[PDB]
Symmetry: none
Subunit: 488 residues, 3 copies
């Protein structure tokens, strides 16, 4: 079996045959075969343009990963928590971190699902830790100087340092066991409990019109008021939320009617199970045929329409049903699944590029995937800082990364152990570069660990500028390392 | 052919003969020779004494560049900017850019004269670009904080990035054809036209006693009150001040009199064109005879005295001429030349003393030459920033260099193509240093483009300090590469 | 001679005897043999406990250095500066310089005693210079912005650059002769004379109750109003404060009584020479017997008792004697030792821990030596900056390092020539690390010499942040070189 990477070394007349014949050049998950499109569907003379197109497509995927994370997933989780009566301070501390880090967890899980992309997963995590800590955080200090809380900052930086050192020693060991993932999850739950306890101690011391309006994502007044760039962003974004409202239910506890749309939701009780079945595991469960006569999707649709009719005739348009909260549960699950699908696509695209340009997995993980996953963090944090809440944004800038690393690594490793029935996940370090990446992350923390206390916790513009220059130097070192300029 | 450095290894009796017989030991800068003075006129026992005189001489040039920029160049540029109602951005983009780039265009053209020198032609350009965009910009920001104009800054940086990318692609391809040269020229013309159009759109939206007192640069009352050191400094500055006042007109718009000094101005109307003629390219045109009967300087004198007589008959003593502002242009142009020669002499100092020192070739064709080319830009920009025009200097910091890159590459390649009768000019990459320079320039541009908008266009001192640190890192990288300790 | 690290691989029975006979396992300058304690006094099963106990001891040491500098060293230095009417620059250049530089010189002499360690000594000197000139200066500027004096700063930086370049060329030649050492000493003498002359030119242009109250470190009024945790902190600080009060006299010009406690000062007049003699070279001079009949300690006790009795009978309790400021000198000198010894202990702990963790000596030999050797400076400079004298500490950050380099190198070389009866001392360059350290020192000096004057001598936080980033880059380069990432 010849390796996929040799494809660029063969004649153009045999590229299609080699791609079609090599099991390695086939991806186990996804809807599109990108390598086939690169080497068979398009002529070789148009090879560069196609790659550019892919990049554009890749960017669009990340946009989806933003919207589903911000407008449907996070509000559904917030409604679920409000059903459990959680405090506002805990919400401000955590929910933004969950909303910003869900794409990171799903991308890491998809990457760890296959050994060949395993090196991508770590490259997705540490690189993000290098970015959000250096650029985004620094950006906040540039936009609005403020005074940072001492004790929460020290706690967050200590927990992040502990997590980073644990992952460093795990990488040095070259393997991840089941007990290690369980310890990661236990450490995260310990951190959450510690945050709760410390906060407590500190505090103590016609139907057609409603469907047309609900399915309309264009607020005409706001769209008219916005500038040209915002108009372009909104028009580019319209199909994504159109599909999302169409398929994903959202429950908002802040609304007196709880976003009750009786016929829209009655249609959704049929739509959501169908998309769930047809999308789970790339639809493999969808075409499974029961007893050799009836496919699953047909009986799923029948049960869904029966339930929708029962609910529609059993409820009224004025008063939401007593079981309205269960909708959010559905509005949770499918939403997460949607993100998963998008995540898978992104990973596949990156792998394809690794075949074409003969690039290492770590370089792709720390450059493209990190930026794509952190664009949502950057937008949310900059918006929060500009609106007059820099303390919350800066606190989240360190709170979310710990949750990202711990939950992503632990859950991905746990699911890989459970699914493959293997006792261990093998981490193969892709040469020297990975070590450099880890080193960079640690150094950044050290800078903060010295810079913030030395300023008496009054963060200024120079701190952000220095962090930005540090990130530029880090990218300089990475670029030198990749192209083989420095080599043992 | 023996290297000129071998002068040091030869016997003291044969050094002068070797210098005389070897054309390579002749000054590339030209004008006053220095090596002949060191090795022929001065005995070796007097050579250490001789050495003291040149260092002192060197410092004197740094005084001249200090005076000409302080009293003649910058006030004339300010008068030109005020007279035409130009904004600071456009004036820095065109006039200060031409004045700063004349030595660089000349050096780039003469270097691009041959196929072997072609690799080096690009490296000096990139080094000068990096130095100007980093150190001069940082100094301007540190000395005087200011608010930059968003749209002109974005336009300038975008055009600079496009030009740098085009030059990088040209280097990667390894050849420059006719189409590339005409494309460079057309791009520069398009940039100038776009600047003009945007500016217009924004806008729409006894006599002998007088001569004697004018020719005196010394004020007796202030001289008496000055300290002994200050008196000595004034005495040292007196000769160059007198010569500049005799040679270079200055028009100060804010004073009502606008420096209208009639007899001195009539004298300048005839001496300044003579200075231009006998200074351009070391007087080659000055020695030229038209048909062997009338020399060029004679015709220049005739035209100058005709104009002087016309002004004498058509102008009065106490009322300014309505076309006085045009005189400023002349005072600008000569002043630029008064800079260039001085700068050249500085180089002719460093290069000469170095042969006795035995400085390495690899480091010089890249450090001394770029610094010598950009010393005029540094002096002019710092003097302008100190006086209270930071915006013009900051805009010129990009305008001069975009002009330099575009017009230098295009005009030099086109002239070489025409003279050599070739279809293309081959480009050789002389090691990793050119690629390092290009990467450094690109990364500096990226850092500026990210940092400046993030600061809400308020350029503080932290930005300048970070730029200085970035230049230190760049010099670290280039010094590491030159020694070969970082091998490909 | 087996490595001391092999103590880990041996059986628990013979580890103590291995520590006993192996000379490399014993520390020459410490009071306590930590390795002997861990491997002999404590059973192996309690080995982790000892480690954590040492950690606690380490922390307690950081408390002593916290108190001695805060209450005894800095007030005495301020009293000396005020009494002699010395400007902050001069006092920081001289007195704080010797106080911070004594342990360097001692370590440099010890290292230069063995010719094989000459390169290690010069590398340690360069590393200490880099650390003090970068990190200490940055922290000093961040903690308290100030306006530095122009002429003293320029003079100090020029002298330091000259010294660094002279050491560089001496290292490049590979030998240091007697003439070089005499030149170093003469240069230091010239520097001191120049400082003094320039300063002159500028200037011209019952007893029992009082003993109990004085020796009581507890203020009951502040004792009652304080919190439980700070009560524990005060209880912990009580013994060292009592010992320091008994040993170190304090003169405070800001108090009406000038901190005059006649019986306590009379007793200190006896105690201070006693403790000085008993700590100098661990009491070797104390055990010395003059002619085999009278020991030195008895003689100094008799002299101190006579002087104390004379002073007691010659002064009253109400008024302090005119020579009271002389006491400050004593209160200065002893305090310095009480810092130095403490610093030594910290090192003798860390090295021991390095034996347990098998840390590679590669990094420790130059870097770890510098941090333990400079910790006293760092403490003194930060404490002085916090109390309101940033200029003195900032000037010390250059004057003291000049003192270290010049005097250490000159005295070590001169002593080696005199002792060994040779004519030169041969310096072997041990790899690229020494060159990297020297180049980093030169680059930091150049960056400071460029940035500070451009800043108009107004030192703000951006300068310190940039210096810290520079140090992080320097440690990055050092780590890259030591690991063999870059091959020559
Ligand atoms: Ca993210
Ligand atoms: Ca120039
Ligand atoms: Ca020291």
């Amino acid at each position: 079996m010849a390796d996929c990477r040799a494809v660029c070394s063969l004649n153009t007349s045999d590229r299609c045959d080699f791609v079609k014949r090599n099991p390695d050049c086939h991806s186990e998950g996804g809807y599109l075969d990108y390598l086939k499109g690169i080497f068979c569907y398009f002529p070789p003379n148009l090879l560069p343009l196609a790659i550019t197109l892919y990049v554009f497509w890749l960017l669009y995927l990340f946009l989806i990963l933003g919207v589903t994370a911000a407008k449907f997933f996070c509000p559904n989780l917030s409604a679920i928590s409000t059903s459990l009566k959680l405090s506002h301070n805990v919400a401000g501390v955590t929910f933004l971190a969950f909303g910003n880090g869900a794409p990171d967890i799903f991308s890491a899980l998809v990457a760890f699902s296959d050994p060949r992309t395993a090196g991508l997963a770590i490259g997705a995590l540490f690189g993000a830790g290098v970015l959000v800590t250096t650029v985004v955080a620094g950006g906040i200090t540039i936009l609005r100087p403020f005074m940072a809380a001492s004790r929460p900052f020290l706690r967050d930086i200590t927990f992040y340092m502990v997590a980073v050192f644990l992952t460093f020693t795990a990488l040095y060991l070259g393997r991840i066991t089941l007990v290690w993932a369980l310890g990661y999850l236990g450490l995260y739950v310990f951190y959450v409990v510690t945050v709760i306890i410390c906060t407590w101690v500190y505090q103590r011391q016609t139907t057609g019109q409603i469907l047309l309006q609900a399915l309309n994502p264009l607020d005409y007044r706001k769209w008219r008021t916005q500038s040209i760039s915002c108009k372009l962003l909104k028009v580019a974004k319209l199909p994504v939320e159109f599909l999302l409202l169409l398929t994903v239910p959202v429950v908002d506890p802040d609304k007196d009617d709880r976003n009750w749309k009786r016929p829209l939701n009655c249609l959704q009780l049929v739509i959501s199970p169908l998309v769930l079945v047809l999308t789970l595991q790339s639809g493999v469960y969808g075409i499974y045929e029961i007893g050799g006569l009836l496919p699953v999707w047909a009986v799923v649709v029948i049960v869904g329409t029966a339930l929708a009719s029962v609910t529609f005739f059993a409820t009224s348009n004025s008063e939401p049903p007593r079981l309205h909260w269960l909708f959010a549960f559905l509005g949770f699950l499918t939403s997460a699944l949607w993100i998963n699908a998008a995540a898978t696509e992104v990973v596949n695209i990156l792998r394809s590029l690794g075949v074409v340009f003969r690039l290492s997995n770590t370089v792709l993980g720390l450059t493209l995937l990190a930026w794509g996953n952190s664009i949502g963090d950057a937008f949310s944090d900059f918006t929060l800082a500009r609106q007059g809440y820099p303390r919350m944004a800066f606190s989240a800038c360190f709170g979310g990364i710990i949750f990202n690393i711990l939950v992503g690594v632990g859950l991905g490793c746990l699911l890989q152990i459970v699914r493959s029935h293997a006792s261990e996940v093998k981490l193969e370090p892709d040469g020297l570069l990975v070590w450099v990446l880890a080193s960079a992350l640690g150094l950044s923390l050290v800078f903060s660990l010295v810079s913030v206390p030395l300023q008496c916790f009054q963060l200024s513009k120079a701190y952000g500028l220095c962090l930005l220059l540090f990130y530029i130097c880090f990218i300089v070192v990475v670029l030198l390392t990749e192209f083989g300029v420095i080599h043992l």
